[PDB]
Amino acid sequence: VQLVESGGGVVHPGRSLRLSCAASGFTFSSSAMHWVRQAPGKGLEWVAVISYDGSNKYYGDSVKGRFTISRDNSKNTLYLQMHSLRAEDTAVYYCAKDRDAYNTVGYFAYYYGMDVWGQGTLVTVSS
């Protein structure tokens, strides 16, 4: 249940930037994942979800097609890459785990919602 983010940075709009995170003990292949954003002075805003395989992989209608989430079973690691990134999307990021597998996302996924997070590290996109 021990999860920690990593990979902060301060980058001006329009280049690559990555974050990563991992945990252990239980099995990571038979669980799902989702990346969360949180702008200071605001609440939280969702970013993306990944199933237990990666086929079903859904992004929020805020930053569709612009952020790329990457991982699979046999690595026990999660990534998040961003290039040609918007200016004021700077925020803290979170690696939470939706406790399900999302072979389907809204049908027989009764118990969605994430268990345990870690205090991550934010990025800064500004001049």
Select 120 or 125, whichever has its Cβ closest to another protein.
Answer: 120
Is 26 an interacting residue with respect to another protein (CB under 8 A)?
yes
Comparing CA positions, the residue from 15, 81, 25, 77 lying closest to residue 48 is: 81
Is 100 an interacting residue with respect to another protein (CB under 8 A)?
yes
Is 2 an interacting residue with respect to another protein (CB under 8 A)?
no
* For the chain, counts of helices (H) and of strands (E): 0, 10
Q: Which residues contact 106 (CB under 8 A, 6 or more apart)?
A: none
Question: Minimum Å distance from CB 15 to another protein?
Answer: 27
Q: How many residues bind another protein (CB under 8 A)?
A: 38
Question: Can you tell me which of 17, 22, 114, 122 binds another protein, judged by CB under 8 A?
Answer: 114
Buried b (16+ CB within 10 A) or exposed e, 81-105: ebeebeeebbbbbbbbbbebebeee
Answer yes or no: are the C-beta atoms of 97 and 3 closer than 8 Å.
yes
Is 76 an interacting residue with respect to another protein (CB under 8 A)?
no
Interacting residue ranges for another protein, rule: CB under 8 A: 26-27, 30-31, 34, 42-46, 49, 52, 58, 60-61, 94, 96, 99-101, 103-120
